[PDB]
Structure formats: C-alpha cells, structure tokens
Design an enzyme around this catalytic site. Structure first.
Site, PDB file in Angstrom:
ATOM      1  N   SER A   1       0.810  -1.216   0.000  1.00 26.73           N
ATOM      2  CA  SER A   1       0.000   0.000   0.000  1.00 26.73           C
ATOM      3  C   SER A   1       0.843   1.264   0.000  1.00 26.73           C
ATOM      4  CB  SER A   1      -0.938   0.018   1.208  1.00 26.73           C
ATOM      5  OG  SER A   1      -1.946  -0.973   1.099  1.00 26.73           O
TER       6      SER A   1
ATOM      7  N   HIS B   1      -3.289  -0.096  -4.897  1.00 28.31           N
ATOM      8  CA  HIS B   1      -2.751  -1.264  -5.577  1.00 28.31           C
ATOM      9  C   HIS B   1      -3.231  -1.213  -7.026  1.00 28.31           C
ATOM     10  CE1 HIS B   1      -2.607  -2.322  -1.316  1.00 28.31           C
ATOM     11  NE2 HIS B   1      -1.645  -3.170  -1.627  1.00 28.31           N
TER      12      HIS B   1
ATOM     13  N   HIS C   1      -4.756  -9.745  -1.005  1.00 30.59           N
ATOM     14  CA  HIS C   1      -4.902  -9.969   0.429  1.00 30.59           C
ATOM     15  C   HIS C   1      -6.056 -10.940   0.639  1.00 30.59           C
ATOM     16  CE1 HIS C   1      -3.562  -5.834  -0.415  1.00 30.59           C
ATOM     17  NE2 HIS C   1      -2.862  -5.890   0.705  1.00 30.59           N
TER      18      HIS C   1
ATOM     19  N   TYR D   1      -8.393 -10.667   2.862  1.00 34.14           N
ATOM     20  CA  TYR D   1      -9.634  -9.944   3.165  1.00 34.14           C
ATOM     21  C   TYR D   1     -10.450  -9.547   1.928  1.00 34.14           C
ATOM     22  CZ  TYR D   1      -7.033  -5.602   2.229  1.00 34.14           C
ATOM     23  OH  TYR D   1      -6.244  -4.664   1.616  1.00 34.14           O
ATOM     24  N   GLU D   2      -9.862  -9.697   0.742  1.00 30.66           N
ATOM     25  CA  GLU D   2     -10.539  -9.366  -0.512  1.00 30.66           C
ATOM     26  C   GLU D   2     -11.413 -10.539  -0.945  1.00 30.66           C
ATOM     27  OE1 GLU D   2      -8.015  -7.347  -3.670  1.00 30.66           O
ATOM     28  OE2 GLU D   2      -6.429  -7.789  -2.253  1.00 30.66           O
TER      29      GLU D   2
ATOM     30  N   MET E   1      -1.718  -6.921   7.228  1.00 29.91           N
ATOM     31  CA  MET E   1      -2.646  -7.919   6.686  1.00 29.91           C
ATOM     32  C   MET E   1      -2.151  -8.639   5.422  1.00 29.91           C
ATOM     33  SD  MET E   1      -5.920  -5.326   6.992  1.00 29.91           S
ATOM     34  CE  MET E   1      -6.286  -4.450   8.516  1.00 29.91           C
ATOM     35  N   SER E   2      -0.848  -8.869   5.316  1.00 33.79           N
ATOM     36  CA  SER E   2      -0.311  -9.536   4.135  1.00 33.79           C
ATOM     37  C   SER E   2       1.104 -10.046   4.381  1.00 33.79           C
ATOM     38  CB  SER E   2      -0.261  -8.546   2.979  1.00 33.79           C
ATOM     39  OG  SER E   2       0.786  -7.613   3.199  1.00 33.79           O
TER      40      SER E   2
ATOM     41  N   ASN F   1       1.646   4.395  10.641  1.00 34.91           N
ATOM     42  CA  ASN F   1       0.902   4.973  11.742  1.00 34.91           C
ATOM     43  C   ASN F   1       1.226   4.263  13.034  1.00 34.91           C
ATOM     44  OD1 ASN F   1      -0.706   2.742  10.352  1.00 34.91           O
ATOM     45  ND2 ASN F   1      -1.817   2.908  12.291  1.00 34.91           N
TER      46      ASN F   1
ATOM     47  N   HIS G   1      -7.277   4.178   6.063  1.00 34.04           N
ATOM     48  CA  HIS G   1      -6.522   3.837   4.859  1.00 34.04           C
ATOM     49  C   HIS G   1      -5.824   4.992   4.140  1.00 34.04           C
ATOM     50  CE1 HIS G   1      -5.158   1.161   1.786  1.00 34.04           C
ATOM     51  NE2 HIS G   1      -5.954   1.624   0.839  1.00 34.04           N
TER      52      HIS G   1
HETATM   53  O1  LIG Z   1       0.214  -5.047   3.484  1.00 35.33           O
HETATM   54  P1  LIG Z   1      -0.122  -4.087   2.372  1.00 35.33           P
HETATM   55  O2  LIG Z   1      -0.281  -4.675   0.978  1.00 35.33           O
HETATM   56  O3  LIG Z   1       0.807  -2.908   2.557  1.00 35.33           O
HETATM   57  O4  LIG Z   1      -1.517  -3.238   2.940  1.00 35.33           O
HETATM   58  C1  LIG Z   1      -1.482  -2.517   4.454  1.00 35.33           C
HETATM   59  O5  LIG Z   1      -2.353  -1.382   4.399  1.00 35.33           O
HETATM   60  C2  LIG Z   1      -3.816  -1.642   4.687  1.00 35.33           C
HETATM   61  C3  LIG Z   1      -4.178  -0.607   5.685  1.00 35.33           C
HETATM   62  O6  LIG Z   1      -4.094   0.857   5.389  1.00 35.33           O
HETATM   63  C4  LIG Z   1      -3.919  -3.168   4.952  1.00 35.33           C
HETATM   64  O7  LIG Z   1      -4.305  -3.920   3.789  1.00 35.33           O
HETATM   65  C5  LIG Z   1      -2.438  -3.536   5.300  1.00 35.33           C
HETATM   66  O8  LIG Z   1      -2.112  -4.912   5.054  1.00 35.33           O
HETATM   67  O1  HPA Z   2      -2.894  -0.012  11.897  1.00 36.46           O
HETATM   68  C1  HPA Z   2      -2.758  -0.926  11.062  1.00 36.46           C
HETATM   69  N1  HPA Z   2      -3.266  -2.225  11.281  1.00 36.46           N
HETATM   70  C2  HPA Z   2      -3.157  -3.299  10.438  1.00 36.46           C
HETATM   71  N2  HPA Z   2      -2.529  -3.209   9.260  1.00 36.46           N
HETATM   72  C3  HPA Z   2      -2.019  -1.941   9.016  1.00 36.46           C
HETATM   73  N3  HPA Z   2      -1.316  -1.560   7.872  1.00 36.46           N
HETATM   74  C4  HPA Z   2      -1.011  -0.230   8.040  1.00 36.46           C
HETATM   75  N4  HPA Z   2      -1.485   0.230   9.237  1.00 36.46           N
HETATM   76  C5  HPA Z   2      -2.097  -0.835   9.824  1.00 36.46           C
END
Ligand SMILES: O=P(O)(O)O[C@H]1O[C@H](CO)[C@@H](O)[C@H]1O
Ligand code: HPA
Ligand SMILES: O=P(O)(O)O[C@H]1O[C@H](CO)[C@@H](O)[C@H]1O
Ligand SMILES: O=P(O)(O)O[C@H]1O[C@H](CO)[C@@H](O)[C@H]1O
Ligand code: HPA
Ligand code: HPA
Lengths: 284, 284, 284
Positions: free
Chosen positions: A33, A64, A86, A88-89, A219-220, A243, A257
C-alpha cells in the site's frame, strides 16, 4: 477447496510472460500500500495489467494498481508487482501466492517483499522503515496456510522450515546501505505479525499483539514469504511504519486507509532510493 | 460445508468392520509420526488398509502407513490407527475425526492418542515422553472445530466441557507404570498446543507459544480429543518430544520431518514397552 | 465463498418488514442465551418468526427462540432479536450478521448487544453484569471476518476503525443508571474475547485468555459489532457473567449450557429493569 492451481498452470503463465518480453529478471519485488512508486525508477520497463496475464488474480484495493512491471533497476533486472492480493478481498492463500511460484519458474532467485504496517513498538515513529527479521503467522495457527493440501514436490518439501526465512546476509547489507545514505533516523528491525483484516484493531487487540512480541502489524506478506521459502527463494522484506497503533482507550484518533497511503507518498523518495541502492549485490 | 457425515455413515462403517473381523476392541490407539511401530506387538492382528474401509479417509504423510489394525496387546483387545489425518493435508476436521466416532460405535471405551511434538519447555530433551495433561486449541479459537454445525444428539451434547478431557486416573497409572520400568529419565507432563501447519514455526512464534503456557507444539490430536470427549470416551495421550524448538535467531539448525521420524525409531523400544504395560488396567 | 448477500437482498427484507408492521424502531436489541426475557417488557409488540421473514437465518440453539419482536420499551420504539446466530451452528459470519444490516436499512441508529459470558476476571462473580468497553476478535486474527470479500460502499468503508466501537457516552449513561437502581453490586466493565466454540475451554486456554487481557469469554457478539460499526451504528453492549471459568486442574466442576440458561433466568428481573431504564436517552 485447497489449492486449485496445478503445476502446469504456473508454467503456462510463466511461458506466456517469457513469450511477451525479452526481460529475464533475477529479482522480484512486491509493492504494498502506497509503495507503488518504486516502479518509477525502472528503465526499459514493460507493463502487463494483471487482467491480461492468464491465471493471474486482480488487486481490488485502493493503492494497488494491479500491474506487473519488468525493468532494469540500478543495473539489476527485476519484475515488480505494483499492488498485491490480500485474504480480506476474498482470496484464498493459494490465489494470494500465485505470482510467487510463477516468479520461481521465470528463473527469479530473490524476492523482496514490502508493506505498510501499523507500529506496535513504542520506539517506532511514523515514517520509519523496519527490516522484517521474523514474523508471527496468526492465520497459520488455525490452518489457513497457502501450503495446505497435497504437496507439490516439484516446488518444495512437505514440511519446510521457517526459522531462517529472512536472509541474514541481506539484512546486513541493508544496514550498511542505510548508513551510506546519511540518514538521521536509524533503520529499525523487528517482527511482523499478520492478521486477517480488513478492519483495524481494537486497543485490547493491540496490547495483546505487542505483548506477544510483535513490532508491527499488517494484513499480508507472510503467506508470500512461506510460499517463497518453500520453493527456495531468498527472501528479504521491510515494513513502512505508516501509523502508530492506538494503545489507550482515550482514542485521540483512529487508523484509516488514506493516512497510510498518504504516508507512503511522504516516504516515497526515501524507500525508492533505498531499494535502488539495495539492488547492488542481491547477489546473483 | 460443515460435517458431511450422517450418523448412518458412521454405523455403516462400524457394521462393515464388525462383519469382517471377530475382534471386539475395548481400547483404540492412534499412532502419530514415527510411532507406527506400536502395531508390532499385536497378536492375532488383522489389518485393513484405509482405502478398503467404506467412508474412511487416507493418510498421505510419510510416517503414516494408513492401516487399521486389530489385535491383542498384552491381554487387551485393541484397534490401532497406524497413521492419522491432519488438517494440513486438506482435510476438514470432520474428516480428520471420522474414525473416533466409528470406534465409539464399535463398543470402544478408551482412546489413547499419541504424537510427535516439538519441545517448548526448556527442561525437555529430545526423546522425552510427555503425558498430555491439557491442551490449547488454536484453530478452535477461530471456529475451526470438528463439532461445528448441527449437533448429533446421538453422540453427545451441544456444549461439551473440556476441562476434564485427559483422564486423571490414567495419568496416575502412567506414572506408576513408568517407575516400574526402571527409567532414568522422568516422565514429563504438560500442555500440548495445536496449530495448523504444515510449515514449522518461526522463532517469534515459538517464544509466543511458550509464553502462552505451552510445553509442546504439534499439528494434530486436539480435534480427535474433542470428538472423543463429546461422545463420552475416556481419553489418555502422550507426545514424544522429537526435537527442541529453535528459540534464538542464531539458528544453529532447523526442524525437519526426517529428524522427527528418526527420533520415533530411536524411541521405538521404549514407547512400545510403555504402551504395552499400560494396557493392564485401562480399566474395562 | 464470501458474502452471498447483495445490497438488494437486505433492502428486500427491510421492505418486507416495513410492509408488515407500523412500528418504526430507532433502537435494535440482540438477546443472548437466557436473555430472551427482555422481550416481555414490550408494549404493542408484534412478533415475526425468523422462518417467515425472507432471507433471515434461523437460531437452532436452546435459549434462542428465533423471533424478531417490534414494540415500545419504556417510551422508545425498538426491535429485538429474541435469539441470535453463532458461527458454531455452521453459519458463515455474513449470515450471522445479516440482521444488523437490515436494521440499518429500517432506520435504526443504535444497536444494543447482550450475551452470556464466562468470567475470566477473578473479581467477577456469577450474576455480574459487565459493560463491554472493548473486544478481542480471535477469529478475525485468522481472516474469518464478516467484511471479508468485496466491500459494499453503500454500507461503509473498506477499512473501518474499531478503536471506538463501544460508545463512550452510552457507557457513562449505563453507570449513572445503575447507581439510580440502588444496586449493591458494582457495574463491571471490561474486554470481551470471542472464540469459535461450541466446546467449553480447557484450563490452559482460560489462563492464556486471561493473560491476553480478557475479562470475559464468549462465542458471539464481535462479528455483529464489526458490521454495526461498518455501517455507522452506535453500539452498546454487556455480558451477563453466567459462570466462573475453571482455572485450576483440580476441576471442582465444569461449564454446562443449562447453568448459563439458569443464570439468565436468575438475573431476569435485574437486566430487564436495567435495559428498560437505559432506553431513556439513547439518544435519538
Ligand atoms: O500489506 P499491504 O499490501 O501494505 O496493505 C497494508 O495497508 C492496509 C491498511 O491501510 C492493509 O491492507 C495492510 O495490510
Ligand atoms: O494499523 C494498522 N493495522 C493493520 N494493518 C495496518 N497496515 C497499516 N497500518 C495498519
Ligand atoms: O502429530 P503427528 O501425527 O505426530 O505428526 C507430527 O509430526 C509432523 C512434523 O515432523 C507434523 O505433522 C506433527 O503434527
Ligand atoms: O453469546 P450468546 O448468544 O449469549 O451464547 C453464550 O452461551 C453459550 C454457552 O452456555 C455460548 O453460545 C455463548 O456464546
Ligand atoms: O517442531 C515441531 N513443530 C510442530 N509440530 C512438530 N511435530 C514434531 N516437531 C514439531
Ligand atoms: O464458560 C464459557 N465459555 C465460553 N462462552 C461462554 N458463555 C457463557 N459461559 C461461557
């Protein structure tokens, strides 16, 4: 249903790519991201939209693009995934990790994984770059794993080890390279913890994750590292701390996001520069 | 889809077994990785390949023969599963636990579960035998459970308790029996933690598991214990500590399947002797 | 397969309800195990069996009637779910949370969630009422989430925050209301942890959950809160502590479903009174 891809499906896709480009990459990079800017440094770039490549899934998450780009980065031939998949999709891990195996069949030897992650370690600041020295696979604890089902001996063994997943030599190189950049902030290093998403964490969940020994949450990445190691690829990766996770009930705000994407653009010139320099000695 | 087996499917399989052997076992034993040697002590043994028994799944993991053996072990009539099923093979927990319910319908009253596990407790040494006094079901925390879906009242209640899963009386017997063997090493006892697999753990994951209070980690057993207790079977089990889990980033090696199998053969004469002696007073 | 409900399915169900009752509720209440008595305080009540409402799932657990009741509670118009759905019944989270989205389309602004939970916090006593100030979503850590799959922009954003899930203002009101009741026991407040079930926990699992920072454990609620917050509903909830979790191997007993139901009836007059009073200032 377990993995729906047969060995031939991977090679069919690999053959198609080989038949549409003269580029023969040795390094593969997966952009997370707000990290899609890394592609801008490629020379002799050729782009393929995921939708035009047989058997390839599609990225549906903002930040993406969904494009496979071949090109030369600081002398090294590489292929980049501008955007990833991911769970979650709605994607099973065997779909999420499809590109990794195709890369192996293209002759790639090194995989570089990047992501945007929430900071758990108190000493981390927004904008920090954390080298991933290890991970904790929460989904794996329950059986959700890209290797579940019959093992394909043509890729790797039934029980691959993960204790040495993140190449030690590459991490040392990363530190030497960082010092050469003249950066004031230190290069962080730690454990990445993966959870399903797509919602952001509660205060209670964050305190728990930190107490489990995690430095950043996301999450990946983990499922890709697992498949990459199973097929013998050297793996190196890092998280951009977008963050600081909320750890107190006096929520002076909350994760979103756009803030992570905003942070990606903010650290664009730094990460791109770092990845470009890293290309020197992958090795080969 | 939840459990695809109807009550009649279990009884059909039970009837078939009853119609093909004169043996009427009271004890059932499930053999884990590298523990298939326990069958060698059976007298009047009759073997059935899993592939010939209606409705039975098949073991695809090296170290799991895939045979149901009936026989007399030190005076007690028993049936053994030479090889078991795991969720990482692609099997839902309702398939993994199919044999347990069939055993209940055969008239079996006691279930003995064994497995090869990685050692988390620092005081454990390779070759140790750990009596399982309790477990932590990680997959269960997320809903992956063999009892998910409509409850079959003919087997047990909707909300079975698990606090008394491992029979206290059998564990005392195990200790008295061990002392009679004249063993120099003490009989260990602890909590077994199950995770999905098939990959081995990272250093970060291992430290976390140990901090959660687990003594040994593995990829099976728990779902069988849950189903066994649901239908009222007395349960007893133990882990053969095949290797010490890597807890430091200075990985002086890494877990591998052959080492666990090798360890099983190494401790063959000891475990077989122990299980044979345990047969005396199951009770009945 | 991810969510099988399309936006139109929710509105179709909402239209049907609107066409069969003159009631226009602003508050929605979900009743847990042994909490179905809360419906008895409704005036001008109209009942709908879940089986007669298009697209609605059905509760199969004893202590869950399976009826949607509209009525006036202490001046406020509300709709109550006398009985809910759980993942251990075989329902995917997208089925479990179907009613929450329908409520949003009915014009509801506030969701009150209740449940029966096992006590982890040592200071809790059977019969205690614990305001849920936060939660830990174990199934979510592995990807099991009601929001998994394509996001429906008509309900909410792709990455909703959860740090402020439980309305702070409602919790303050709950405390002021409790003091007005003249109760001798204090109103508890804490973190609720959800796990899959349907079996009850082992001693090892309970010690772990407590050490993760949880005060009460249960098998529901969290997925509903997640969907509720995603669509912008104000959420408030509480757990009735029906039993004290077994934390020692000297099991002087064990958890059972009837004891929790029994406890619900035991605390009937108290909870109903509390919920009735809370209706004053939801706000609106
Ligand atoms: O892991 P990438 O592909 O950076 O995405 C990161 O950013 C998202 C949160 O803003 C979530 O999907 C997290 O996994
Ligand atoms: O705060 C968060 N939580 C989970 N995944 C993330 N990816 C960017 N920030 C975060
Ligand atoms: O639990 P059993 O059947 O012993 O198998 C143990 O051995 C394997 C690792 O060598 C994993 O499958 C683990 O679960
Ligand atoms: O959460 P509710 O709907 O109260 O049900 C609680 O009660 C049951 C145990 O007695 C479990 O289903 C648990 O989740
Ligand atoms: O190291 C291990 N990890 C998980 N399961 C195991 N079973 C034997 N050894 C191990
Ligand atoms: O002991 C319990 N465990 C899990 N859920 C529960 N709901 C009520 N009691 C319990």
């Amino acid at each position: 249903m377990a993995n729906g891809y047969t060995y031939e499906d991977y090679q069919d896709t690999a053959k198609w790519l080989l038949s549409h480009t003269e580029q023969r990459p040795q390094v593969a990079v997966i952009c997370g991201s707000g990290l899609g800017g890394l592609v801008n440094k490629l020379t002799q770039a050729q782009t393929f939209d995921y939708s035009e490549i047989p058997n390839f899934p599609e990225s549906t998450v903002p930040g993406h693009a969904g494009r496979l780009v071949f090109g030369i980065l600081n002398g090294r031939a590489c292929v980049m995934m501008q955007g990833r998949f991911h769970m979650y999709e709605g994607y099973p891990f065997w779909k999420v990790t499809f590109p990794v195996r195709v890369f192996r069949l293209l002759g790639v030897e090194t995989l570089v994984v990047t992501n945007a992650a929430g900071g758990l370690n108190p000493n981390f600041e927004v904008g920090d770059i954390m080298l991933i020295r290890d991970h904790i696979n929460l989904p794996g604890f329950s059986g959700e794993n890209p290797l579940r089902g019959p093992n394909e001996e043509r890729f790797g063994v039934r029980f691959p080890a993960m204790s040495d997943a993140y190449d030690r030599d590459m991490r040392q190189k990363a530190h030497s390279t960082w010092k050469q950049m003249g950066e004031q902030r230190e290069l962080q290093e730690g454990t990445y913890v993966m959870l399903g998403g797509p919602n952001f964490e509660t205060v209670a969940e964050c305190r728990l994750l930190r107490n489990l020994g995690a430095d950043a949450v996301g999450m990946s990445t983990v499922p890709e590292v697992i498949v990459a190691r199973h097929c013998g690829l050297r793996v190196f990766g890092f998280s951009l701390i977008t963050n600081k996770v909320i750890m107190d009930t006096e929520s002076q705000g909350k994760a979103n996001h756009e803030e992570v994407l905003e942070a990606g653009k903010q650290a664009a010139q730094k990460l791109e520069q770092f990845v470009s320099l890293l290309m020197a000695s992958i090795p080969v």
